Amino acid sequence: GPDSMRVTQEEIKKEPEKPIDREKTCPLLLRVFTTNNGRHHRMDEFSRGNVPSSELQIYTWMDATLKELTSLVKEVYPEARKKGTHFNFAIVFMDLKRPGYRVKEIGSTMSGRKGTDDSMTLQSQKFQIGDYLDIAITPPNRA
């Protein structure tokens, strides 16, 4: 008859994500790159040992949410506080097949508006220390 077998990784039933005990966990250093041209940085900008020459560094935890992070970005780039400003987040991560980096868009938020990705966390998107965060910021109403 049919045999029992171990479940493959893709079909593994995972528990719901849990908050981090931030008081007992040393924060990670998150490197955030930003654009204002309407698109993410290209992967050629992360090649040959280089990164973009502007960046924001943040101490945070694996349960950091997109809204928490945009609040910090707004501290340094106040024009981005304008209601309707759009923040498009992507994780830039090492390419394991070829040299350099790859990118995966994860979600977006908007100044002054509640949205479905506001509570999306780094851990939910399998962010790893060593990865970069890229945020493409665009003005209200797709101006």
- Domain ranges (residues) in the chain: 1-143
Q: Reduce the DSSP state of residue 13 to 3 states and report it.
A: coil
Break sites following residues in the chain (C–N > 2.5 A): none
Method: X-ray
Burial class (CB in 10 A: 0-12, 13-18, 19+), 99: exposed
CA pair distance 120, 136, nearest whole angstrom = 17
In degrees, to the nearest 5, what angle opens at C-alpha 87 toward C-alphas 82 and 51?
Answer: 120
CA pair distance 74, 71, nearest whole angstrom = 5
**Resolution reading in Å:** 1.5
Say which residues have a Cβ less than 8 Å from residue 8's Cβ, sequence separation at least 6.
none
CB atoms within 10 A of CB 122: 26
Q: Looking at the structure, give the CATH architecture of the domain made up of residues 1-143.
A: Roll (3.10)
Q: Are 134 and 89 in contact (CB under 8 A)?
A: yes
The β-bridge partners of 131 are: 129
